[PDB]
């Protein structure tokens, strides 16, 4: 439970430290203190706060990079004193860590977006967040409404004033002066109305079809 969340949060750092270590090895200078994963600031104790998905509930973990190498994390006014390491049996790596004086070993398989803790007594499932900008939802939020790149005669519109909108469907075909280009629906929401009728022309960066808010 609460300890299990801490165990996974430790695993992210250890994997990140090791991958931080690997790039150091190929580098010219593998001796600088910068390569150290200490995360130490001058006169201040560095703290980073996490968020991990736990089934239905998201939980915020505050990791303070302690001065000695011990690892301090706190979730709902319960603190946990954690120290751990990564060692591999065969080809699979085990996570050995002690939380508040209790230590155990568990397989640590790390996917792209999920955290795996494997143990004799049971298994634990933790999910890493996905940034919204990386989720491509931000990509559709870049443009508020459709814009016509160039002025041209609209041959015909595939969508009526009120019509269902499918992904990939073309709003209309607009051909102009040695160029035909096909305008798509920016968003899957049902059209509020179509701005331009057949045969009309819209300038560069001009609205073409109104869409309901998603």
């Amino acid at each position: 439970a609460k300890e299990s969340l801490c165990q996974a949060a430790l695993g992210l750092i250890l994997k990140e430290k090791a991958m931080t270590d690997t790039f150091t090895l190929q580098a010219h200078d593998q001796f600088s203190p910068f390569s150290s994963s200490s995360g130490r600031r001058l006169n201040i104790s560095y703290t980073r706060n996490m968020t991990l998905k736990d089934g239905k509930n998201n939980v915020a973990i505050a990791v303070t990079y302690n001065h000695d190498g011990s690892y301090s994390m706190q979730i709902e006014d319960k603190t946990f004193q954690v120290l751990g390491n990564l060692y591999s049996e065969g080809d699979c790596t085990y996570l050995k860590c002690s939380v508040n004086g209790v230590a155990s070993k568990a397989k640590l398989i790390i996917l792209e977006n999920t955290i795996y803790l494997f143990s004799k007594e049971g298994s634990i499932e933790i999910d890493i967040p996905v940034p919204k900008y990386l989720s491509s939802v931000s990509s559709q939020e870049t443009q508020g409404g459709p814009l016509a790149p160039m002025t041209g005669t609209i041959e015909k519109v595939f969508v009526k004033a009120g019509d269902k909108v499918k992904a990939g469907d073309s709003l209309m075909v607009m051909i102009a002066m040695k160029m035909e280009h096909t305008i798509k629906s920016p968003k899957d929401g049902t059209v509020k109305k179509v701005f331009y009728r057949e045969g009309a022309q819209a300038n560069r960066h001009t609205p073409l079809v109104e869409f309901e808010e998603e």
Binding site: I13, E16, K17, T20, F23, A27, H28, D29, F31, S32, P33, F34, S36, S37, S38, G39, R40, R41, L42, N43, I44, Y46, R48, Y65, P131, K132, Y133, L134, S138, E141, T142, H205
Partner: protein, 541 residues
């Protein structure tokens, strides 16, 4: 072949000795006091400004820096005590700006971020000084730099100290142009509105990123436009990430939230296509043989007692291995070769009042290190200087000049640390701030000033005594203590480590325990700049 064993420096201080106990207690008191103050500074502008900055959806500057750097990596903040009680009644934590050096995408780079919480990100005179110091450090070390602009503009009530002078505001742009000229990269990231201070910066930089809503790039603010041209319009119409991106082209990238801007910045740094290469022999590094905290009991908080330098050197260098150079001659000064974090260094330190012989030894050592391309580190505790009729007859001043010339003409990177009291022209001799050391730090105990207070009080007493005697009413027996007291008090106030660190005479105040770590970081960054030929002026015999 490297099988020969080497003698190691340092011994075991007698813990039971009452002197060690006393020195330890003093050093703890100083370190504790420093820690509490640094906490209070890091809180920033105060709870209310933090609440408002959060309310706008922005991320607090400390959070931004933590996300930006390669996670799980050290970061070296500089001059945190800037503006400490410097002004009459205005609280300016950290000089309203956070500057430092960090490793991003595997490449060291300097981060400079405004703190809009503190006084709306106005540029106080100290703020400009701090920022310019950071930029010059980056250029000498040849490091890419990144700006996180959330500033409004220059502080109006003090315009004389900001706008006009050569080293004043605006020199920032000149440095930016020079940096971009010689391939040193520049990156600007915009999170807040800017009025003519953070307006040229994105235009001045090669790359540009601006957040969708909270970012607005505009040369003149809405109140400035309304007051000047008689026309009012919101800064978004002049700024805005989308508005500038579609048409103006000032913004090379268009980010949605603060996190997105940070992530894009990492991508750009990776694409920058730079590779670091070294030009010095490197060896495996091992920890010093003795605990560092013992330095407290060794040093204490009294300038009167003396501590041998070799104890400190043993506490610092790798494996506590050292090779003294010309040990018996000029014993008041110590020089030698050592290795720190696998890098060769030349250590120069002070034990007592300088003499002519010590100056000659230092000059010879400097020539050797410059010839062999070895970095230099200085540990100055100048309790007294070279003064005496016999000394000046043989030109001890001339030998001091030899120190000055050798230090000034040197081209290898130099780092200086003020372990003990610094006074007199020796500050000039042992690579003072004026002599452009790449860095400079002071322990919490050190006091720096031109002269000890007692000396100046005596000198002023004598000159007034002589002239007033010529005036017929000599400096009487009375008023002697009355005249002496203010001089002693004033020199004590000006010599305080916090007082100097309030200005930018030093890069930071560090406890002795962290010393070793800091040095390694500094030297690593300094190695980015390729070493060059060292040319010496006339060596006056």
């Amino acid at each position: 072949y490297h099988g020969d064993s080497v003698a190691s420096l340092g011994t075991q201080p007698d813990l039971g000795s009452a002197l060690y106990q006393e020195n330890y207690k003093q050093m703890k008191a100083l370190v504790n006091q420093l820690h509490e103050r640094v906490e209070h500074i890091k809180l920033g502008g105060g709870e209310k400004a933090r609440a408002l900055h959060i309310s706008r959806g922005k991320l607090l500057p400390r959070e931004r820096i933590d996300n930006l750097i390669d996670p799980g990596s050290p970061f070296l903040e500089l001059s945190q005590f800037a503006g400490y009680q410097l002004y009459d009644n205005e609280e300016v934590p950290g000089g309203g700006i956070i500057t430092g050096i960090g490793r991003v995408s595997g490449v060291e780079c300097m981060i400079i971020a405004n703190d809009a919480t503190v006084k709306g990100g106005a540029y106080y005179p100290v703020t400009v000084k701090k920022q310019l110091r950071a930029q010059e450090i980056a250029m000498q070390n040849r490091l890419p730099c990144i700006y996180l602009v959330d500033s409004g503009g220059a502080y109006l009530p003090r315009q004389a100290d900001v706008f006009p002078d050569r080293d004043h505001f605006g020199r920032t742009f000149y440095n930016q142009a020079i940096m971009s000229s010689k391939n040193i990269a520049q990156i600007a990231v915009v999170m807040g509105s800017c009025t003519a201070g953070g307006a040229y910066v994105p235009a001045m930089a090669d790359e540009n990123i601006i957040v969708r809503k909270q970012g607005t790039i505009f040369l003149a603010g809405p109140p400035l436009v309304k007051a000047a041209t008689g026309e009012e319009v919101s800064a978004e119409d002049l700024g805005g990430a989308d508005l500038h991106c579609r048409k103006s082209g000032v913004s090379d990238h268009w980010a949605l939230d603060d996190h997105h801007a940070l992530h894009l910045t990492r991508k750009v740094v990776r694409n920058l296509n730079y590779q670091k290469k070294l030009d010095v022999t490197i060896e495996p590094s091992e920890e010093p043989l003795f605990p560092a905290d013992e330095l407290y009991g060794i040093v204490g908080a009294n300038l009167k007692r003396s501590f041998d330098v070799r104890e400190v050197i043993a506490r610092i260098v790798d494996g506590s291995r050292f090779t003294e150079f010309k040990a018996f001659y000029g014993d008041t000064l110590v020089t030698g070769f050592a290795r720190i974090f696998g890098y060769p260094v030349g250590i120069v330190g002070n034990n007592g009042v300088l003499f002519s012989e010590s100056a000659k030894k230092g000059t010879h050592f400097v020539q050797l290190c410059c010839q062999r391309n070895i970095p230099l580190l200085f540990l100055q505790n100048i309790t007294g200087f070279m003064v005496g009729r016999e000394y000046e007859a043989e030109g001890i001043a001339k030998d001091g000049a030899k120190m000055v010339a050798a230090v000034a003409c040197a081209q290898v990177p130099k780092i200086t640390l003020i372990i003990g009291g610094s006074y007199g022209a020796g500050n000039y001799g042992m690579c003072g701030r004026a002599y452009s050391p790449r860095f400079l730090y002071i322990w919490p105990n050190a006091r720096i000033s031109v002269m000890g207070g007692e000396q100046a009080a005596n000198v002023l007493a004598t000159i007034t005594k002589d002239q007033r005697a010529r005036e017929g009413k000599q400096f009487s027996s009375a008023d002697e203590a009355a005249l002496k007291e203010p001089i002693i008090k004033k020199f004590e106030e000006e010599g305080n480590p916090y007082y100097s660190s309030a200005r930018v005479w030093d890069d930071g105040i560090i406890d002795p325990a962290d010393t070793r770590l800091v040095l390694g970081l500094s030297f690593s960054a300094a190695l980015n700049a390729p070493i060059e030929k060292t040319d010496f002026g006339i060596f006056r015999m």
